[PDB]
Amino acid sequence: MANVAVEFLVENLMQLLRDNVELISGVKEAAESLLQDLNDFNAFLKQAAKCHINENEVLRELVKKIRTVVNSAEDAIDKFVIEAKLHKDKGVTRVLDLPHYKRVKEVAGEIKAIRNKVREIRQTDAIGLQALQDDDLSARGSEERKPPVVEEDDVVGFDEEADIVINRLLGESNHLEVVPVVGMPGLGKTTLANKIYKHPKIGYEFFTRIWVYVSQSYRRRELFLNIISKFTRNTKQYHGMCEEDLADEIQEFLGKGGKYLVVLDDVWSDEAWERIKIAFPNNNKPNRVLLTTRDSKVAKQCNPIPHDLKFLTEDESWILLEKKVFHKDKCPPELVLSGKSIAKKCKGLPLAIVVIAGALIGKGKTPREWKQVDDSVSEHLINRDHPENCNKLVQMSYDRLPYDLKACFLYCSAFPGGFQIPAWKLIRLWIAEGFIQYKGHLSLECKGEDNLNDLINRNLVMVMERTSDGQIKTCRLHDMLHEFCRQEAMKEENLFQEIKLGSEQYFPGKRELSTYRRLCIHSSVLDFFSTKPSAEHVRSFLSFSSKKIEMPSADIPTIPKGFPLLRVLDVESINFSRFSREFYQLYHLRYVAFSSDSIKILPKLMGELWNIQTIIINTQQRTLDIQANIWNMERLRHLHTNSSAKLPVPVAPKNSKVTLVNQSLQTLSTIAPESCTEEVFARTPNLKKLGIRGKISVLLDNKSAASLKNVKRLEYLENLKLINDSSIQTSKLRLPPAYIFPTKLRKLTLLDTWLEWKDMSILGQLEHLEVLKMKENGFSGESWESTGGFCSLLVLWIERTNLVSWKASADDFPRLKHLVLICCDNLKEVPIALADIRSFQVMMLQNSTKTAAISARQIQAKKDNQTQQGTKNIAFKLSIFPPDL
Amino acid sequence: MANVAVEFLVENLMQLLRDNVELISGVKEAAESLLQDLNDFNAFLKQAAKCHINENEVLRELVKKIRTVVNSAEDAIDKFVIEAKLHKDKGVTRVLDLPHYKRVKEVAGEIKAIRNKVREIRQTDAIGLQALQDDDLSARGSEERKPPVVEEDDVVGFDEEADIVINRLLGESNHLEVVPVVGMPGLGKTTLANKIYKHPKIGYEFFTRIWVYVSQSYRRRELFLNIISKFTRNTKQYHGMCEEDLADEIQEFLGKGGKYLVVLDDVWSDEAWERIKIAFPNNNKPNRVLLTTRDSKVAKQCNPIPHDLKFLTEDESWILLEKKVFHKDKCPPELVLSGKSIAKKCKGLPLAIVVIAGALIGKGKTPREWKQVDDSVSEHLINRDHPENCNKLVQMSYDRLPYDLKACFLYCSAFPGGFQIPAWKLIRLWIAEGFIQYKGHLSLECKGEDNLNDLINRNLVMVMERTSDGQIKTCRLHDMLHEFCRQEAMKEENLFQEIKLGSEQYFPGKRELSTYRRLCIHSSVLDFFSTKPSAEHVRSFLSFSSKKIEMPSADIPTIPKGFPLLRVLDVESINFSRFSREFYQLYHLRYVAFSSDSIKILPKLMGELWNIQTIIINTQQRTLDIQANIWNMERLRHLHTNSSAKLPVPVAPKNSKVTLVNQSLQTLSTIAPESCTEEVFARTPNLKKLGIRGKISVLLDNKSAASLKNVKRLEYLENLKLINDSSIQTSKLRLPPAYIFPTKLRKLTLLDTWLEWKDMSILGQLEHLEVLKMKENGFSGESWESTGGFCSLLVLWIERTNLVSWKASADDFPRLKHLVLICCDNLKEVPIALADIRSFQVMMLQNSTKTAAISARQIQAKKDNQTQQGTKNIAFKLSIFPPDL
Ligand SMILES: O=P(O)(O)O[C@H]1[C@@H](OP(=O)(O)O)[C@@H](OP(=O)(O)O)[C@@H](OP(=O)(O)O)[C@@H](OP(=O)(O)O)[C@@H]1OP(=O)(O)O
Ligand SMILES: O=P(O)(O)O[C@H]1[C@H](OP(=O)(O)O)[C@@H](OP(=O)(O)O)[C@H](OP(=O)(O)O)[C@@H](OP(=O)(O)O)[C@H]1OP(=O)(O)O
Ligand SMILES: Nc1ncnc2c1ncn2[C@@H]1O[C@H](COP(=O)(O)OP(=O)(O)O)[C@@H](O)[C@H]1O
Ligand SMILES: Nc1ncnc2c1ncn2[C@@H]1O[C@H](COP(=O)(O)OP(=O)(O)O)[C@@H](O)[C@H]1O
């Protein structure tokens, strides 16, 4: 929507005028006039939106040439901004310094020319309401959208096929065979496969099972690294092995553990199946593999008897539609007829129902809306096998979307098809692109998360992993939806443009690149940067590669000089040996994510990019030294980093009354313990997530417990993470008193701390803490006896600890929901009192002692009895990773 | 509720531990113990609340005494705090301050005794905790509540009485007669009176209408001065004029203006009517007085033909109850029988029905709850004449009320009965007393506002005036509810005790004053403070008087010495000429409201009190030079004042990296323009309401300090006020560009600005500004021609302007809903284009040109036709000051 670009330009111009006046002093008057006209045309575009746009070419023409003028104004303003900053760099004290000054205010003359063009547009419709405001539709208020709790986990109508396949399993013991699952894309084949892969009988028959995604454009070596990594604790030895040596290692590991079932999803081509099949040992075991392929030919090649997947019936279609739209409630009688008719028209494709239900929940719950959508679906689905019909359905659903969500939904497809998108990354990117403008009181991150939840609720985005606390971790768009979004954003809206090197595709030259606004490179990027490309009007650069691609020492200056107006730079997959001097002139940089392996310092000149919001640094070094003054940066909002980051000691200016209190800051992933001083925590009043990585002894030492004492000050802190790197238990550590931990702390994670289980009482004294995760021997001891306190704890996660005896009563954990017990090889028993917790929903046991498994089974039986006794107790599910335990 | 005391103690203790260790260094261990045992006691009390403590005697005792130890622990800890700060004052640099350290350690011995007493009882609490937890009830989550917009304004089945009354008037012209209104309390007589006082026929016949409240304890001169205040601005002169001569002036003012109606509200005794009737001239005109009384004898004396109020009929009862319970929505069929039975059981007393509706709202909307309510009401309403039936009904409603809200109703009674409680003051009290605890993310004030709105929704608190934008401005408790709340809070929970004295009675002695927690004095207070009283366990002192009482120069230091452990000091109605030293030693002070007339300098030592939230100062001086380092009082949240305060110039400490950035702050009501400086705004990042008073020119002048520019920094500001005191128009003032104003600004007010009507475009450019109030010639000029911009503006308020020609199109004010044209004696007419605005509902035209009023009637007729034309247009209301128009 043009509204988005207009609003972002307005906001950026206002910010420029307020904060830095000198930069805009030369042009400030033209800037202000442009800003007024921008507000006016934002209102104009809103009105034009009120009227049907896709049903009128004249309307689109009207809004057109506002977008072009806006882009020209944007580019002129940015070029002047950078030029004036270079003038400041020149530091020319001369009152009249014509060189570059004539031409810079002549860029201001480009700004004035575009200002005049904006004025001419204003003239064309001085009112802007001459004929358009006369018409307005969809006038209504906006209501609340609610959180996306897990629902309809039951798969409608796929149990019969699942049973058929699970019967197809173990047909001929002592042999390896592949079970083909065939169906048109979007028929739910991967849903059936996932259901089977988690079925209890499947888990019990095969001790080992693996899920592998074989994209249309997979790479074999990554795939084998992925498969092996599950079985091995370390992949270092195999990182230097060849594809075939890797296959042999996989065969060995996989034959170690008896039988096995491997699921290969979306095997596009026969050649891929042939290339991969070698790693599976036909070891004369009753082994199996389940493949999901959209093509009948490859399915026949794999096995002459493919399992043809069935369309859902009309009754099943209606059931799924109602389930999706009304969740746990029931469809009002007046809407039942329309819903059933729609489901009938769907033809039974689960994806079609899942999308139409999204459209319905988007629109509303009145019979008129349902009649309208029924008419639309009748019109658009006359044919059956044409793949464009689902595209038309997606068009229907996407039309109703709010424009702010339309921008985000489009931007989602920038990621390579089949990529698992880190939700936090996606949200920080949205914020960096300005798609989410401050609307109300919610913090930006919270608003973005809400956006993502609405997207998922509509079903326009699929969820892959949920963090322990249940929120979203990684999501991906469906293949057809990904294609739709790619085509839409690339053609209709020109949001971004992809450069995929096919067997024949050759790099577009400078002239085509001049038109692009955002680049995404997901194929060989080193070849692209050997071209020494150039583009002034590319603002964003995205590269979501699979491998990590070193940057040649000669091509490093290609990114800055190639694009000097960059805003979003997502180059995590690209190792940089160092940073050229032209990185310190990308002044329009908001988001900057990259990787490295030899970077030990962030040079102070990085402190000049005054605009940046996010910073991500994935460096292998153990110690990273941030010399760049994060405090000077006025808008820093995130500082993720793996290494231990040593923040610069704050230094209040001797003659300035500026308080360097960054009020926007919201994260500091792994600051070093040595920089948890009082000042650092003074400067981040609104800090919402903190983590430390280093020698936790300095902090937790009482003789030096002033540091976690300092952490007592971040009133808003909600996520604390303590990570110990020192491998020597040079002394014992004691947790300071419970009152020292900020009162809202909801999530704590401990790793290699070696604390006494007698300190669990302190964490019991915390009242809001809701997810506790201790890994790599966070707490040391053989006997632990729960003393209550965890009033609001929801997920308990113990991993790799030498605990032996655990004693607790039902009242120790009133609100426990998820219990994760990994690699506790030395715990004799699990207290049965836990069987008496109502919140206790799902239990997981992994690499644990046999007595623990026995006690867990007693707990399962006990909770089954409790539910059978009529008590409204939520369903219980137990999952021991090794079935034999 | 005990949980409230325990929670407040816990929070205060935790804060003391975190901030100041030296104060607690002596008894840190006992402090932390107390903290733990208090948390456990709070959990125990919650659990006991889950069960019905009243049902079991053992429970009543078990809950009992946990509170006493908590009260005992508070007294000892507070006394230690003050004694230790006194030690700091001594500054005894000796390593062992054996003299008087053994005194503060005597207090510490009290502390340690208390800690041991808590550990005891905690043991006694340990036993039986399981027996308590075995039982629970009302297991449910908490749902959202919604804002209380005006609803059910119409009065059920009362138009018969209204028309009968309006008929009674005009019986005998050229004569003065008073019409009695009789009925039991809460029967709605005031409702009927207000209905009549607003009826269009009444507003047309009598030009001069006056509404007067005559409490049980009125004071004649007070109301006479108020009546005079209606006709002329000031009352200070007549403050030097006798009551009978006041009455003469009232009679003259009233007789000059044609006919007159006056409503005397809630007349109790005959003598009061006799005394007050004097002011009304029987000048041989058709004038009437409408008195409402609960006694038949006074009514009969005033007239042998009293108007008995009628009970509501069963159908009327049910319609009223349904309207209250279900608001606009109709009753669900399954609850109709229960609702009708309940209404029938109320015997037609509107107050009983109203409280029952509140109770039903509190319970929910399930048939079981309605059956339970029906049973209960049948139980408690066997009798009719006994007034205690309504007390039982309010008790029934109260029991279902959350304890946070419960803490109110009872604290609401503290305000003197019949007093109009300023909502903002009430909320800041709430906060200061600690009744409102951080639960979530809403700013404290917002949580208070929602509490108050919920109280109104349950109908327990009746509202009196709303601000222009509609948010509540002034509420009070109904008489029956007030007596119920006062008795309850004084007896059951001992929240506070009133000291008001009867004839032949004496002020309670020091022994009695030793068992008080809060003092409310609403009668002679100078007499009380001439007793030289003394109490150590009084934390709050409230004095909501009528007249401003001075404090004798010899009797000043009674309060600081009478009570040294004060928190709330609400002495707004007591004029202090100076402050004693013993006042500065008060350290437990949160709230401090007081008046004055000669106080020009806020003392420096006043800045030592670390714990203050609010500050109110009604100094008559024009300037109030503040020298208290507000920057150092870390909990400061308001600095209300009326004169032009001058905040101290901030200075970041030379040798401390601690930034003096207050982030709780919310308002700096009336600072001086000289103190609208950069730093003063850097130090208050979260400021949410600013006002200025002084020579607005120095702001609008850029040479002194770009101060209205500096206002740009307060990203959260939402209420601005520019008050100009300079009466000399030295030069014209020009508003800065619209981008300077904070983006969220939602309310602006300009008095004496004398800005040129051309600038109104700048205020048009603002996008959220919702209420513009220009009073006493805000803008100077004679021709105003709207150019648009006020997209979101909702209320327009013009007072005392020389505007002659106003030109506008319907597109300039799309969202307008309220228009106020006060004292526009030079304006000719208002653009009829406003008649086309759908949102336009209410417009008030006071003391303006008759041509403007004719245009107003044209607008009214046009909107009448518009609504008649089938458009879903909201009802329109026209208010015109003089009847002839
Ligand atoms: O600390 P944990 O409870 O073990 O959770 C971590 C943490 O994420 P959260 O604290 O937000 O939950 C890490 O956060 P970052 O390091 O990315 O800031 C994240 O990443 P790492 O793997 O690099 O530690 C990691 O991911 P994973 O689950 O893959 O181990 C995992 O996140 P979740 O708990 O959200 O899944
Ligand atoms: O209700 P108040 O607390 O008395 O304040 C509001 C207004 O501010 P807001 O409109 O933002 O609420 C002014 O602010 P303050 O003076 O209270 O700081 C106030 O000014 P004055 O009291 O000096 O007149 C004015 O007073 P008034 O009610 O007499 O108009 C009154 O106006 P509203 O209640 O209509 O908002
Ligand atoms: N049996 C089913 N019940 C409900 N939804 C289903 C079912 N089968 C498929 N779907 C939905 O159909 C859509 C397409 O399936 P998906 O799992 O995304 O990929 P695939 O088509 O490869 O199976 C998704 O929204 C999926 O949840
Ligand atoms: N139809 C009605 N007639 C009278 N009061 C009504 C009616 N409907 C609701 N009420 C409410 O019942 C109460 C009537 O008594 P009230 O006016 O409070 O007492 P009093 O007349 O003694 O001041 C008010 O709260 C009023 O708003």
Short mmCIF file of N, CA, C and O and ligand atoms in Angstrom, two decimals, chain A residues 424 465-469 471-473 640-642 669-670 689 693 719 721 723 747-749 771 773 775, ligand 1:
data_model
loop_
_atom_site.label_atom_id
_atom_site.label_comp_id
_atom_site.label_asym_id
_atom_site.label_seq_id
_atom_site.Cartn_x
_atom_site.Cartn_y
_atom_site.Cartn_z
N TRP A 424 11.66 -13.75 16.16
CA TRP A 424 12.23 -12.53 16.70
C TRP A 424 12.96 -11.74 15.62
O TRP A 424 12.85 -10.51 15.56
N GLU A 465 7.97 -24.31 15.35
CA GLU A 465 8.37 -24.61 16.71
C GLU A 465 7.86 -23.52 17.64
O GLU A 465 7.95 -22.33 17.34
N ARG A 466 7.32 -23.95 18.77
CA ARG A 466 6.90 -23.05 19.83
C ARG A 466 7.89 -23.16 20.97
O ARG A 466 8.26 -24.27 21.37
N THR A 467 8.34 -22.03 21.49
CA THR A 467 9.23 -22.06 22.63
C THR A 467 8.55 -22.81 23.78
O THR A 467 7.36 -23.12 23.74
N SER A 468 9.33 -23.10 24.81
CA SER A 468 8.80 -23.84 25.95
C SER A 468 7.58 -23.14 26.52
O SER A 468 6.52 -23.76 26.71
N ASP A 469 7.69 -21.84 26.79
CA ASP A 469 6.57 -21.07 27.32
C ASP A 469 5.40 -20.97 26.35
O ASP A 469 4.39 -20.36 26.71
N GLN A 471 5.04 -19.53 23.27
CA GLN A 471 5.01 -18.53 22.22
C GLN A 471 5.75 -19.05 20.98
O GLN A 471 6.31 -20.14 20.97
N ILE A 472 5.74 -18.24 19.93
CA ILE A 472 6.18 -18.67 18.61
C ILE A 472 7.70 -18.57 18.52
O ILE A 472 8.32 -17.64 19.05
N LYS A 473 8.30 -19.54 17.83
CA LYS A 473 9.75 -19.58 17.65
C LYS A 473 10.16 -19.53 16.19
O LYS A 473 11.08 -18.78 15.84
N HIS A 640 21.87 -7.92 20.31
CA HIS A 640 22.16 -9.34 20.37
C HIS A 640 23.62 -9.60 20.02
O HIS A 640 24.22 -8.85 19.25
N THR A 641 24.20 -10.63 20.63
CA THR A 641 25.55 -11.07 20.35
C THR A 641 25.77 -12.41 21.04
O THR A 641 25.25 -12.63 22.13
N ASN A 642 26.52 -13.30 20.39
CA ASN A 642 26.85 -14.57 21.03
C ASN A 642 27.98 -14.41 22.03
O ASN A 642 27.85 -14.81 23.19
N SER A 669 21.95 -9.06 24.93
CA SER A 669 21.95 -10.51 25.00
C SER A 669 22.99 -11.05 25.98
O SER A 669 22.62 -11.67 26.98
N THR A 670 24.27 -10.85 25.71
CA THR A 670 25.32 -11.50 26.49
C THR A 670 26.44 -10.53 26.85
O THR A 670 27.61 -10.77 26.57
N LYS A 689 15.09 -7.50 28.46
CA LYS A 689 15.70 -8.82 28.43
C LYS A 689 17.20 -8.65 28.56
O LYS A 689 17.81 -7.88 27.82
N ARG A 693 27.25 -13.67 29.95
CA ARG A 693 28.05 -14.82 29.55
C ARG A 693 29.50 -14.52 29.90
O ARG A 693 30.09 -13.58 29.36
N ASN A 719 13.47 -11.05 31.43
CA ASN A 719 14.13 -12.27 30.99
C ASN A 719 15.61 -12.18 31.31
O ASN A 719 16.33 -11.37 30.72
N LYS A 721 19.28 -14.35 31.85
CA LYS A 721 19.99 -15.54 31.42
C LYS A 721 21.41 -15.46 31.95
O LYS A 721 22.12 -14.48 31.66
N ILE A 723 25.07 -17.43 31.99
CA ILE A 723 25.85 -18.42 31.26
C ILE A 723 27.28 -18.35 31.74
O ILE A 723 27.91 -17.29 31.71
N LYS A 747 11.24 -15.29 33.44
CA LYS A 747 11.93 -16.38 32.76
C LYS A 747 13.41 -16.33 33.11
O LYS A 747 14.09 -15.35 32.81
N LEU A 748 13.89 -17.39 33.75
CA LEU A 748 15.28 -17.48 34.18
C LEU A 748 15.89 -18.76 33.62
O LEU A 748 15.23 -19.80 33.56
N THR A 749 17.15 -18.66 33.21
CA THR A 749 17.87 -19.79 32.62
C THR A 749 19.28 -19.83 33.18
O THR A 749 20.00 -18.83 33.10
N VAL A 771 9.14 -19.70 33.91
CA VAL A 771 9.87 -20.71 33.16
C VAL A 771 11.30 -20.77 33.67
O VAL A 771 12.08 -19.83 33.50
N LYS A 773 14.88 -22.93 33.64
CA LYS A 773 15.61 -23.82 32.75
C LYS A 773 17.06 -23.85 33.18
O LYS A 773 17.79 -22.87 32.99
N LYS A 775 20.63 -25.86 32.69
CA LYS A 775 21.28 -26.72 31.72
C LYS A 775 22.76 -26.85 32.05
O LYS A 775 23.35 -26.00 32.72
O1 LIG C 1 17.51 -19.51 27.56
P1 LIG C 1 16.60 -20.67 27.16
O2 LIG C 1 15.39 -20.80 28.04
O3 LIG C 1 17.36 -21.98 27.03
O4 LIG C 1 16.04 -20.27 25.71
C1 LIG C 1 17.04 -20.05 24.68
C2 LIG C 1 17.21 -18.56 24.45
O5 LIG C 1 15.94 -17.96 24.02
P2 LIG C 1 14.89 -17.30 25.03
O6 LIG C 1 15.64 -16.93 26.29
O7 LIG C 1 14.32 -16.09 24.33
O8 LIG C 1 13.83 -18.36 25.28
C3 LIG C 1 18.23 -18.29 23.37
O9 LIG C 1 18.14 -16.87 23.04
P3 LIG C 1 19.23 -16.08 22.16
O10 LIG C 1 20.57 -16.67 22.53
O11 LIG C 1 18.86 -16.32 20.71
O12 LIG C 1 19.12 -14.62 22.54
C4 LIG C 1 17.98 -19.10 22.11
O13 LIG C 1 19.16 -19.00 21.24
P4 LIG C 1 20.53 -19.83 21.43
O14 LIG C 1 20.26 -21.24 20.92
O15 LIG C 1 21.55 -19.11 20.57
O16 LIG C 1 20.91 -19.83 22.89
C5 LIG C 1 17.73 -20.57 22.40
O17 LIG C 1 17.37 -21.24 21.15
P5 LIG C 1 17.26 -22.84 21.09
O18 LIG C 1 15.87 -23.21 21.58
O19 LIG C 1 17.49 -23.23 19.64
O20 LIG C 1 18.35 -23.37 22.01
C6 LIG C 1 16.62 -20.76 23.41
O21 LIG C 1 15.39 -20.16 22.88
P6 LIG C 1 13.89 -20.65 23.22
O22 LIG C 1 13.80 -21.05 24.67
O23 LIG C 1 13.02 -19.45 22.92
O24 LIG C 1 13.59 -21.82 22.30
#
